Amino acid sequence: TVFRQENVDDYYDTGEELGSGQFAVVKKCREKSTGLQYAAKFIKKRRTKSSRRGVSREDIEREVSILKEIQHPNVITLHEVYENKTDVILILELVAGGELFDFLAEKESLTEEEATEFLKQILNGVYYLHSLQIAHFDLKPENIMLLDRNVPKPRIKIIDFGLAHKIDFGNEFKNIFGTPEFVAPEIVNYEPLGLEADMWSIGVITYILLSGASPFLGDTKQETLANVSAVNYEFEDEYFSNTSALAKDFIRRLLVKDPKKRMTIQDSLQHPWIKPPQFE
Numbered sequence: 001t002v003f004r005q006e007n008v009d010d011y012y013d014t015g016e017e018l019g020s021g022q023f024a025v026v027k028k029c030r031e032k033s034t035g036l037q038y039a040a041k042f043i044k045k046r047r048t049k050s051s052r053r054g055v056s057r058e059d060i061e062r063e064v065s066i067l068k069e070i071q072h073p074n075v076i077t078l079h080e081v082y083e084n085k086t087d088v089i090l091i092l093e094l095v096a097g098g099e100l101f102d103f104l105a106e107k108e109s110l111t112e113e114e115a116t117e118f119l120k121q122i123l124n125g126v127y128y129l130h131s132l133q134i135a136h137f138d139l140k141p142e143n144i145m146l147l148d149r150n151v152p153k154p155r156i157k158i159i160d161f162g163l164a165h166k167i168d169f170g171n172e173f174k175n176i177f178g179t180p181e182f183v184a185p186e187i188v189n190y191e192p193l194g195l196e197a198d199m200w201s202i203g204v205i206t207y208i209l210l211s212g213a214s215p216f217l218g219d220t221k222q223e224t225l226a227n228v229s230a231v232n233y234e235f236e237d238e239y240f241s242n243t244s245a246l247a248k249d250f251i252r253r254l255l256v257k258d259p260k261k262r263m264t265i266q267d268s269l270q271h272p273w274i275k276p277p278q279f280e
């Protein structure tokens, strides 16, 4: 699939840099013809077939294909895609309230209500994605953006579909690997992966939202991964002494090693609490 090859600079003006990754950089931008603002994600292309630098065409096209199919309040949308010799430039919906990661860093820890307000939106977005058999595979605070953080109940959108895959055969087997602190045991063990992996990540995010602490984080990546595979975590009283037993129950049913025994996204929405790379 080829994309628009005219110079993006002839149609957009860029500004502040929103995020910087290993093979991608995101900058705020404005479309000249409408005055509307977006987030331009510049993904570096591979210069040869056998290169570690850059992202393969296959991987870029997968992210674009998935983004083109989604339209939901809690997920980022794709506006246009350009490309040149060195990059594929995705013009994405702008989320200017910053990362949930930075929001949590400035506030330390939330109340269960504040935590559930964020979680419910994440669950709604994931429910949409999983309904389309799309596994995100990289869910974490850094990949959740707020529309406006200067409001008591910030609205959010899930971003970064660089590892997202269509799961049409129930599972994918291709060494997909996200951030150690949030990956499920099956990722750590290089086993077939499915929508269940995202549910584990949601459990980790929930633990963090409520305590301000990471459940499996070790001093090294290998330690973290070892902790994940052994489901080595506990609810420290210093952090959870005033957290409800139901909230812990919700987390406990997500941080389950056997993917088949883990709550599904539908289960999470009906749960009593809710119901109204790897080397370094």
Ligand SMILES: Nc1ncnc2c1ncn2[C@@H]1O[C@H](COP(=O)(O)OP(=O)(O)NP(=O)(O)O)[C@@H](O)[C@H]1O
Pocket (backbone or CB within 6 Å): 018, 019, 020, 021, 022, 023, 024, 025, 026, 039, 041, 043, 044, 055, 076, 092, 093, 094, 095, 096, 099, 142, 143, 145, 159, 160, 161, 162
């Ligand atoms: N739509 C958006 N609106 C605002 N900020 C965004 C948006 N998309 C991404 N960002 C920011 O840019 C950062 C990096 O974007 P991301 O999509 O995660 O790239 P990446 O997948 O890490 N790229 P790469 O390093 O090439 O694998 C994020 O963590 C956000 O802070």
